[PDB]
Amino acid sequence: MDIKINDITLGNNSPFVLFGGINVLESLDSTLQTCAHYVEVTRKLGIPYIFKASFDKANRSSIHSYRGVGLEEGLKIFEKVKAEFGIPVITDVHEPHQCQPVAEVCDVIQLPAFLARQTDLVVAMAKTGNVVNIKKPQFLSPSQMKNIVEKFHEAGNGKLILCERGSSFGYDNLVVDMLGFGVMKQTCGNLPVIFDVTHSLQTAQALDLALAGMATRLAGLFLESHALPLHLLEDFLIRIKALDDLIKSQPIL
Amino acid sequence: MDIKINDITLGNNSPFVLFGGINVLESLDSTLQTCAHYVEVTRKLGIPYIFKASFDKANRSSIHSYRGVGLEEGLKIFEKVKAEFGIPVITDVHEPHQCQPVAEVCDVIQLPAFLARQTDLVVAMAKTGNVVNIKKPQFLSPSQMKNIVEKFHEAGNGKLILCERGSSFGYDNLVVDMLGFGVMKQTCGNLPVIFDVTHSLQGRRAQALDLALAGMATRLAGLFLESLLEDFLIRIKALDDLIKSQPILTI
Amino acid sequence: MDIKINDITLGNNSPFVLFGGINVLESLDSTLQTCAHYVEVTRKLGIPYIFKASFDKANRSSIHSYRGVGLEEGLKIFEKVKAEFGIPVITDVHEPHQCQPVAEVCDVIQLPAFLARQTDLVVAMAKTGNVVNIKKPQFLSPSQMKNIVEKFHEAGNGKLILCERGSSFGYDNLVVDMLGFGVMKQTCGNLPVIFDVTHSLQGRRAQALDLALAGMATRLAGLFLESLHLLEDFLIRIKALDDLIKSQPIL
Amino acid sequence: MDIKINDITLGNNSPFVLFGGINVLESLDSTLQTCAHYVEVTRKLGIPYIFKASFDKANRSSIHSYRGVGLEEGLKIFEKVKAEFGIPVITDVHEPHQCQPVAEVCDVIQLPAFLARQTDLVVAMAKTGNVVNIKKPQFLSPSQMKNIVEKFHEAGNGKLILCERGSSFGYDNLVVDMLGFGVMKQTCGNLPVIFDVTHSLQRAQALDLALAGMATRLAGLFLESHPDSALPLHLLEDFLIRIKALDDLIKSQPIL
Ligand SMILES: [Cl-]
Ligand SMILES: [Cl-]
Ligand SMILES: [Cl-]
Ligand SMILES: [Cl-]
Ligand SMILES: [Cl-]
Ligand code: NA
């Protein structure tokens, strides 16, 4: 199943879509600057692009840690990103009441991995009618992703993206099961599957891991820069596009 | 560090406390009925008991599974349980705004494992000043509990219980690391540690018994059941009495 | 099923047997010194005791590294231990050809965890007719122990002990699944199950104590270990817990 | 670091080498027919090819399932394969005494993963001076491979290949950590790294896993087929076409 996001066709047999951006919104000017680098690089490379950022870091290690600009500022910054660049955007939501107002602005709304079993958040997200990015919890097997998809379907929203971010591997370490992509395709109605390489690394390896995941034939790549050094983005993406073009050119089977 | 909960002393050197009850509150009649059975068994063996139920469960098996009776009626039911049986109670909260009114009634407030990192909820819970049960995520190592504890401390509350529920072991399976209890005690200032055996298992009674006995062998403040019962508790109490009556290793 | 080893009765509803000694045999006199200590401690505590040692270090730090006394002298040393102390002994074997000569001297022959699938070693060990300790591989599920037991049974030996030594938990780490003990009993015909706490352990004295206590809480035939008076402090506590558990009827 | 195996160059920057064959040597004529198919397909696609089989499978499903033709007959069969097709061969050894006779015939000798820390076998293998394929144990981290390599180096052999076969993931299951390839390259002096996809499993799965691995820039791919977890022999060509496509792309771009 493909999903149209404005003029972008997102699908597991379509050219890969870059979901790219930053950890958290910090100011308008820094956001616009970073986003302009992404747009410029992806435009020239011919890669469909969706800008990513959180408006709030809800689970930092200290109650005093900087959390980003917050929701009201955040949606103001997103509105300007959309106006200036004409691209879709994606952000995460942490509380049910945030969903509809966030969804008025942000094209794709994201269910954080920790909150996949917050059933009222699922319901509130589904009710917006927006495209949804479901972050696969590190504690959830690829065959059980269907359980989350089921909930969204029962709540009336079938515009769902499945986002790999690694699986718990002993303590304080993650492993990406390259077979999980295919399991998710087979068991969740071939919904778009994307790969968050950035959060998968938590514990030069970013390129190798990204290439490996995209070799399994995926709708998109999800990443953050500062995270990849921003100036390496073009060279990084040249590689990814080379591999994606090759895989997508091969008949399935 | 011990925590007084009404007449109960909760601590890793104290007789173990049983936490148990029902999944979600339906009605006063239904609640008092189940609570009465736990109360009768625990009173028969002299085991301290805290009744558990959810008034509004956000982590449900299905979208339309009953969440519980809700805040207003749920707290009335809890008030009744406390009055009738003279026991403390425990309930989970998932909304920051719910922490304060819940804390007027519920002796212990529980932080769901999936929300254990959610700063706004932690702060809202801390600010109640109530005893808090921190459920350890299956994806967090025991040495990361100190960070959650630290956030409660920042927000002004040190009346904290750490609750083991298992750790992710490949796909689907949970394993309980018996060494994790000690790691939590050493890094978190010997706070009360309790063992959620029921959720550690995601026949079944025989499994639960072995696992409960193994955990309680490590010297724990409590045992947590979302869950015959007399036979089980006799065995737990026997082991717990033996263990707690011996001094900790000499240094 | 119980196994008689001289006058020791080994089984899951009998008083636990200690399997203890040293990593690798180095010299007769240090061997006799160490064995003397275990014998003295276990005797005065009333615990049956089997002395353990390897005649060879199969995985060595360097290709030049020590290695141990080797089979020839190793068996000399075991002969003297048995003569001096009148106790049974246990050693591991790594090559099928070693099995019959080692079994002439050593009461229990041990299948190393990493060789548990070496079918020729399995067969060679079974052919000796000796008591066999099967070390559970750290990759193998407890239910799959029945496959190794089956091979020993087809090869004509049912005098088998199953030995827990932890399961792989991410990289460079082990966890002991306390539910595995019961699975092995249920699926392998209640053969004796013992717990290698030493190798399960990927301050640390209290870790080993907690872990041993948790395992022995599941009702086991024995404990396998290596070593101010820490052995007796440890064993006093293990014995007290084992005595309790073995006095309760099986549920 | 590259290794020359007859006229094949094996290395992490070279066109991938296929290490392909069967589980257990059972026979002469069937072995030759299977090998002939591997040869025909690999020659058609221009892919360097090394035939694989065990003559003595020590890890068996039952105590009396056939171990294989054994040392002397196995080596005779390998000699015939080499004579008939002009290709190198690879086999495994489980005992120090087997090392010399096997190394005299076989172009690569393989250290079984479960034996990879057995110092006596490591030394006996090293001292052959033969090219060695070291299977990474499923219970061993990628950063620990340098310790096996060190032991080979101490015994005088540096012609070493490191072979991924997955890591233990919960019970009775494996996952392939795609980051481990790079860890092994960086910590083990960029020795050739190869990927045993067959034993990493437990197929469209085989193809996905193989492509993911080869995307990380590897010296070779290790697999088994069945003449009628092993790939169907008649689908070999389609499979290798897809692998070759990705390998040729990756290898044609400079490392970033
Ligand atoms: Cl994110
Ligand atoms: Cl997660
Ligand atoms: Cl959890
Ligand atoms: Cl092989
Ligand atoms: Cl292995
Ligand atoms: Na050779």
Short mmCIF file of C-alpha atoms in Angstrom, two decimals, chain B:
data_model
loop_
_atom_site.label_atom_id
_atom_site.label_comp_id
_atom_site.label_asym_id
_atom_site.label_seq_id
_atom_site.Cartn_x
_atom_site.Cartn_y
_atom_site.Cartn_z
CA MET B 1 15.41 3.06 53.44
CA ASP B 2 12.00 2.10 54.82
CA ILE B 3 8.65 3.67 53.91
CA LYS B 4 5.76 3.82 56.35
CA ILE B 5 2.39 3.26 54.73
CA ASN B 6 -0.17 3.75 57.47
CA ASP B 7 0.66 0.95 59.99
CA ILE B 8 2.79 -0.92 57.38
CA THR B 9 6.61 -0.73 57.23
CA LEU B 10 7.74 -1.33 53.64
CA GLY B 11 11.41 -2.12 53.25
CA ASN B 12 14.00 -4.64 52.08
CA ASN B 13 14.66 -5.83 55.65
CA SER B 14 10.96 -5.90 56.65
CA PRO B 15 8.38 -8.70 56.26
CA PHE B 16 7.26 -8.66 52.64
CA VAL B 17 4.16 -6.75 51.67
CA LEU B 18 1.66 -8.17 49.17
CA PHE B 19 0.36 -5.81 46.47
CA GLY B 20 -2.56 -7.24 44.54
CA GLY B 21 -6.14 -6.84 43.48
CA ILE B 22 -7.89 -6.41 40.17
CA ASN B 23 -7.02 -5.07 36.76
CA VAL B 24 -9.70 -2.34 36.46
CA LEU B 25 -12.37 -1.02 38.84
CA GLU B 26 -15.92 -1.91 37.74
CA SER B 27 -18.15 -1.34 40.79
CA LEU B 28 -18.08 -1.05 44.56
CA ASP B 29 -19.75 -4.48 44.96
CA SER B 30 -17.38 -6.21 42.57
CA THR B 31 -14.33 -4.55 44.18
CA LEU B 32 -15.24 -5.29 47.79
CA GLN B 33 -15.83 -8.92 46.80
CA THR B 34 -12.35 -9.45 45.34
CA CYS B 35 -10.65 -7.30 47.98
CA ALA B 36 -12.35 -9.36 50.72
CA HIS B 37 -10.73 -12.57 49.43
CA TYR B 38 -7.19 -11.10 49.44
CA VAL B 39 -7.89 -9.54 52.87
CA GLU B 40 -9.11 -12.84 54.35
CA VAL B 41 -6.12 -14.85 53.04
CA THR B 42 -3.52 -12.27 54.04
CA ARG B 43 -5.09 -11.74 57.50
CA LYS B 44 -5.09 -15.52 58.01
CA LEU B 45 -1.31 -15.63 57.47
CA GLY B 46 -0.50 -12.20 58.97
CA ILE B 47 0.87 -10.74 55.73
CA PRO B 48 0.67 -6.96 55.14
CA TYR B 49 -1.55 -6.21 52.16
CA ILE B 50 -2.09 -3.26 49.80
CA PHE B 51 -5.07 -3.46 47.43
CA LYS B 52 -4.42 -2.57 43.77
CA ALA B 53 -6.76 -1.59 40.96
CA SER B 54 -6.88 0.81 38.02
CA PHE B 55 -9.58 3.52 37.85
CA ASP B 56 -8.58 4.62 34.29
CA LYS B 57 -6.23 2.34 32.38
CA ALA B 58 -4.66 3.85 29.22
CA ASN B 59 -2.62 0.76 28.30
CA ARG B 60 -5.51 -1.58 27.39
CA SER B 61 -5.55 -4.77 25.29
CA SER B 62 -8.02 -3.19 22.83
CA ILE B 63 -9.18 0.35 22.10
CA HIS B 64 -12.67 -0.32 23.49
CA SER B 65 -11.75 -2.49 26.45
CA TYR B 66 -13.24 -0.90 29.59
CA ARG B 67 -10.81 1.68 31.02
CA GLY B 68 -12.41 1.48 34.50
CA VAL B 69 -15.08 3.50 36.28
CA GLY B 70 -13.03 6.69 36.03
CA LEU B 71 -11.57 9.16 38.51
CA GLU B 72 -14.66 10.34 40.42
CA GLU B 73 -16.32 6.95 41.04
CA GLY B 74 -12.96 5.16 41.31
CA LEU B 75 -11.84 7.32 44.20
CA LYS B 76 -15.19 6.77 45.96
CA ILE B 77 -14.65 3.01 45.62
CA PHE B 78 -11.08 3.27 46.97
CA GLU B 79 -12.34 5.39 49.94
CA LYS B 80 -14.80 2.58 50.68
CA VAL B 81 -12.12 -0.15 50.46
CA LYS B 82 -9.93 1.74 52.90
CA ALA B 83 -12.79 2.37 55.35
CA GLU B 84 -14.15 -1.19 55.19
CA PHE B 85 -10.89 -3.11 55.36
CA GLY B 86 -8.49 -0.64 57.02
CA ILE B 87 -5.85 -1.28 54.32
CA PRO B 88 -3.86 1.05 52.07
CA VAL B 89 -4.48 1.09 48.32
CA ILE B 90 -2.49 1.63 45.14
CA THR B 91 -3.49 2.86 41.73
CA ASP B 92 -1.80 3.91 38.51
CA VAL B 93 -1.98 7.39 37.02
CA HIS B 94 -1.08 8.34 33.43
CA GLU B 95 -2.29 11.97 33.27
CA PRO B 96 -0.33 14.67 35.15
CA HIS B 97 -3.59 16.46 36.07
CA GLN B 98 -4.97 13.32 37.73
CA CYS B 99 -2.11 12.95 40.26
CA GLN B 100 -3.34 15.47 42.82
CA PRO B 101 -6.96 14.32 43.31
CA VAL B 102 -5.89 10.62 43.28
CA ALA B 103 -3.33 11.34 46.00
CA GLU B 104 -6.13 12.63 48.31
CA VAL B 105 -7.27 9.01 48.63
CA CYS B 106 -4.76 6.55 47.24
CA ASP B 107 -1.88 5.83 49.59
CA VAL B 108 0.48 4.73 46.81
CA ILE B 109 0.43 6.11 43.25
CA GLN B 110 1.99 3.97 40.52
CA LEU B 111 4.00 5.20 37.53
CA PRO B 112 3.31 2.92 34.55
CA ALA B 113 6.47 1.36 33.08
CA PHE B 114 5.80 2.83 29.61
CA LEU B 115 5.62 6.37 31.13
CA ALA B 116 8.59 6.01 33.52
CA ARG B 117 10.67 8.54 31.52
CA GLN B 118 7.84 11.07 30.97
CA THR B 119 9.12 14.12 32.86
CA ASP B 120 5.74 15.91 33.19
CA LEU B 121 4.12 12.85 34.82
CA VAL B 122 7.08 12.21 37.12
CA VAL B 123 7.02 15.82 38.34
CA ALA B 124 3.24 15.81 38.82
CA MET B 125 3.49 12.54 40.77
CA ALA B 126 6.43 13.73 42.87
CA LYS B 127 4.56 16.92 43.82
CA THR B 128 1.71 14.94 45.40
CA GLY B 129 4.12 13.99 48.20
CA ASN B 130 2.60 10.48 48.21
CA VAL B 131 4.44 7.18 48.13
CA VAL B 132 5.26 6.33 44.49
CA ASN B 133 5.72 2.95 42.87
CA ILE B 134 8.11 3.21 39.93
CA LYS B 135 7.64 0.36 37.45
CA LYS B 136 10.89 -0.54 35.68
CA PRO B 137 10.56 -0.61 31.88
CA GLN B 138 11.42 -3.96 30.28
CA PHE B 139 13.83 -2.06 28.00
CA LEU B 140 15.72 -0.27 30.84
CA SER B 141 18.74 -1.72 32.66
CA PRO B 142 18.69 -1.80 36.46
CA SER B 143 21.49 0.81 36.62
CA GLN B 144 19.26 3.31 34.76
CA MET B 145 16.65 3.34 37.55
CA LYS B 146 18.91 5.80 39.42
CA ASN B 147 18.08 8.43 36.76
CA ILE B 148 14.33 8.11 37.27
CA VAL B 149 14.90 8.23 41.05
CA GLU B 150 17.00 11.38 40.54
CA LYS B 151 14.14 13.13 38.70
CA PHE B 152 11.71 12.34 41.56
CA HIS B 153 14.31 13.73 44.01
CA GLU B 154 14.70 16.91 41.91
CA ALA B 155 10.91 17.31 42.10
CA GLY B 156 11.02 16.87 45.90
CA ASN B 157 9.81 13.27 46.61
CA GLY B 158 12.00 10.41 47.97
CA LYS B 159 9.17 8.05 49.07
CA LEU B 160 9.90 5.78 46.15
CA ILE B 161 9.45 2.08 45.45
CA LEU B 162 11.18 0.34 42.56
CA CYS B 163 9.16 -2.38 40.88
CA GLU B 164 10.75 -5.15 38.80
CA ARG B 165 8.67 -6.45 35.84
CA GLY B 166 11.23 -8.36 33.67
CA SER B 167 13.57 -7.42 30.84
CA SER B 168 13.18 -7.92 27.10
CA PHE B 169 14.82 -11.23 26.06
CA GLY B 170 14.91 -11.58 22.28
CA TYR B 171 11.42 -11.46 20.73
CA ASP B 172 8.28 -11.50 22.94
CA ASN B 173 9.94 -13.20 25.91
CA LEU B 174 10.77 -11.52 29.24
CA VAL B 175 13.46 -12.73 31.57
CA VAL B 176 13.94 -11.62 35.18
CA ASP B 177 17.57 -10.88 36.04
CA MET B 178 17.87 -11.83 39.70
CA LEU B 179 21.04 -9.69 39.85
CA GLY B 180 19.07 -6.58 38.92
CA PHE B 181 17.48 -6.33 42.40
CA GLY B 182 20.92 -5.84 43.98
CA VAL B 183 21.99 -3.35 41.32
CA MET B 184 18.85 -1.29 42.07
CA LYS B 185 19.43 -1.39 45.83
CA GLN B 186 23.12 -0.39 45.52
CA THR B 187 22.63 2.45 43.03
CA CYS B 188 19.29 3.80 44.35
CA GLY B 189 20.01 4.15 48.06
CA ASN B 190 18.41 0.88 49.20
CA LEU B 191 14.90 2.05 48.36
CA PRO B 192 12.18 -0.60 48.72
CA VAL B 193 12.24 -2.98 45.79
CA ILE B 194 9.20 -5.12 44.95
CA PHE B 195 8.65 -7.80 42.35
CA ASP B 196 5.75 -7.74 39.88
CA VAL B 197 5.76 -11.49 39.12
CA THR B 198 2.49 -11.38 37.16
CA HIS B 199 3.70 -8.90 34.54
CA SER B 200 7.07 -10.59 34.49
CA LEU B 201 5.26 -13.55 32.90
CA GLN B 202 3.71 -11.12 30.33
CA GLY B 203 1.31 -24.67 34.96
CA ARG B 204 1.30 -20.85 34.97
CA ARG B 205 0.78 -21.02 38.77
CA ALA B 206 3.74 -23.40 39.17
CA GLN B 207 5.92 -21.05 37.06
CA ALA B 208 4.78 -18.01 39.04
CA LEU B 209 5.64 -19.83 42.27
CA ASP B 210 9.23 -20.68 41.24
CA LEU B 211 9.82 -17.17 39.89
CA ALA B 212 8.23 -15.50 42.96
CA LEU B 213 10.34 -17.68 45.30
CA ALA B 214 13.57 -16.94 43.36
CA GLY B 215 12.96 -13.15 43.50
CA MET B 216 12.00 -13.11 47.18
CA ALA B 217 15.19 -15.15 47.90
CA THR B 218 17.14 -11.96 46.96
CA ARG B 219 15.58 -10.10 49.95
CA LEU B 220 12.77 -7.84 48.74
CA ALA B 221 10.23 -5.43 50.30
CA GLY B 222 7.26 -6.87 48.43
CA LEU B 223 5.51 -8.97 45.85
CA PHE B 224 3.15 -7.63 43.30
CA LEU B 225 0.35 -9.72 41.81
CA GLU B 226 -2.23 -8.78 39.21
CA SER B 227 -3.80 -12.03 40.44
CA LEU B 228 -4.80 -21.53 45.63
CA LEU B 229 -3.59 -18.09 46.77
CA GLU B 230 -3.21 -19.29 50.37
CA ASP B 231 -0.95 -22.19 49.34
CA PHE B 232 1.12 -19.76 47.28
CA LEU B 233 1.41 -17.15 50.06
CA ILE B 234 2.31 -19.84 52.65
CA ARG B 235 5.36 -20.76 50.57
CA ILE B 236 6.36 -17.12 49.90
CA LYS B 237 5.95 -16.23 53.56
CA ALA B 238 8.03 -19.28 54.66
CA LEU B 239 10.95 -18.22 52.42
CA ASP B 240 10.56 -14.54 53.26
CA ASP B 241 10.60 -15.20 57.05
CA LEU B 242 13.72 -17.33 56.69
CA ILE B 243 15.59 -14.78 54.56
CA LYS B 244 14.61 -11.67 56.57
CA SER B 245 15.54 -13.28 59.88
CA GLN B 246 19.18 -13.64 58.76
CA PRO B 247 21.62 -10.76 58.79
CA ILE B 248 22.93 -9.55 55.42
CA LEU B 249 26.43 -10.91 54.51
CA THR B 250 29.29 -9.73 56.79
CA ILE B 251 31.71 -7.14 55.35
#
